[PDB]
Amino acid sequence: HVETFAFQAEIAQLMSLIINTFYSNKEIFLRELISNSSDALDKIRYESLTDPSKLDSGKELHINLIPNKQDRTLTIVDTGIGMTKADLINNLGTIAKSGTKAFMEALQAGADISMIGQFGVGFYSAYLVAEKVTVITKHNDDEQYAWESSAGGSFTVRTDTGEPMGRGTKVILHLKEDQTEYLEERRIKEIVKKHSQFIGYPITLFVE
Amino acid sequence: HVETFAFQAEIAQLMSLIINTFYSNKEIFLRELISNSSDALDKIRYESLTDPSKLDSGKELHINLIPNKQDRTLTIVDTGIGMTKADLINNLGTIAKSGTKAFMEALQAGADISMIGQFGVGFYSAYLVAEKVTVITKHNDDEQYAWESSAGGSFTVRTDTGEPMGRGTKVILHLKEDQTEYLEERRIKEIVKKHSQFIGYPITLFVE
Ligand SMILES: COC(=O)c1c(-c2ccno2)n[nH]c1C
Ligand SMILES: COC(=O)c1c(-c2ccno2)n[nH]c1C
Ligand SMILES: [Mg+2]
Ligand SMILES: [Mg+2]
């Protein structure tokens, strides 16, 4: 059964600015997501140093970029640390609140949207290119969840019955109609090269 | 009683390159250290969301830059999550090993030293400006430690009998003789402005 939650007003605010503002340099969504994955692989790797059994849900620490033209999706998968239900519903909301206010103040000082990751709310750049985002995630301590928002002030969470994923986070981008350049192999390659060349984990770009 | 440890060969290697290479843009040591603190405050803040008693060792999450001309030291203090003894001796060594190899490969491709933080070995940029580094640190789960290295292949760790610090990390830079510009108020201000303007925690610069 699906639970529907309201975003705190400040996150709603941020998701609308990202959606409504004219800002043509949308491609940074991809370095933000890949950074987010890089951060989650670091946390699982570190944890596993003092508790090797934390890697029983999978030994490989890696990033996969999967485009799907027929579904119009670009999916970013990592086998990072994952998100618990509390993360999805309470924790990330709390943190994103003060990063949003800083990111908000910064813009009314002449910062721009590409700097969104310095404020720990990188994830929301997904709304530059996606009309809907679905996040499948599995943490060691909790069940597998599906989270979802087309923005407009609310999100849902359900327990996920799909393919079990071991441990990590899949971020599925349902791309806006004018944004299908990010399904193209040479375009994704160009962005990873330009913005993500030094990520400490293999990034595999799947072909269609 | 003081325990002396050898750095793994790869870290020794990196500490010598940093020390021996001609590279005039030394001021980035400060953004790397302040980033490291920012990362440690984030981890304590997050932990405390699911366990408020983690903040009993101190509620304030903040960065202090303290210069001392008579001691020739610049100290960076945070009240972040801290380092356990295992961190100091085993854990950070393990992580710094593969970040060093990537940072090493990157340079023999025309990357430069300012990019050291993308490889998770930012901390070692301290050796651009300091002949000796001392790190006092307190984690919730362990005792207070003093760690220390003038490089040359070894470091020491002892339990620290000094002023108890609550929780966090003080990084004390014993500056090389030609590097005292970083004791000057207007110089530190210039670097924080230039490289660290958007840190999510108050950074207080102490005067002498
Ligand atoms: C994986 O998605 C996220 O990172 C996320 C966030 C988030 C990440 C950073 N700030 O918020 N909130 N809610 C979700 C599902
Ligand atoms: C606070 O000092 C450090 O961050 C550190 C490190 C370190 C940080 C990042 N890589 O290594 N190793 N050993 C020490 C004492
Ligand atoms: Mg919210
Ligand atoms: Mg070592």
From Swiss-Prot, chains A, B:
Residues 1-208 are annotated as: Interaction with NR3C1. ISGylated. Molecular chaperone that promotes the maturation, structural maintenance and proper regulation of specific target proteins involved for instance in cell cycle control and signal transduction. Undergoes a functional cycle that is linked to its ATPase activity which is essential for its chaperone activity. This cycle probably induces conformational changes in the client proteins, thereby causing their activation. Interacts dynamically with various co-chaperones that modulate its substrate recognition, ATPase cycle and chaperone function. The gene is HSP90AA1. This is Heat shock protein HSP 90-alpha. It is found in: Nucleus; Cytoplasm; Melanosome; Cell membrane. Belongs to the heat shock protein 90 family. Changing residue 82 to D: Abolishes ATPase activity. The TPR repeat-binding motif mediates interaction with TPR repeat-containing proteins like the co-chaperone STUB1. The lineage of its organism: Eukaryota, Metazoa, Chordata, Craniata, Vertebrata. ATP binds at residues 36, 78, 97, 123. Disulfide bonds: none annotated. The modification N6-acetyllysine is found at residues 43, 69. The chain holds residues 16 to 223 of 732 of the full protein.
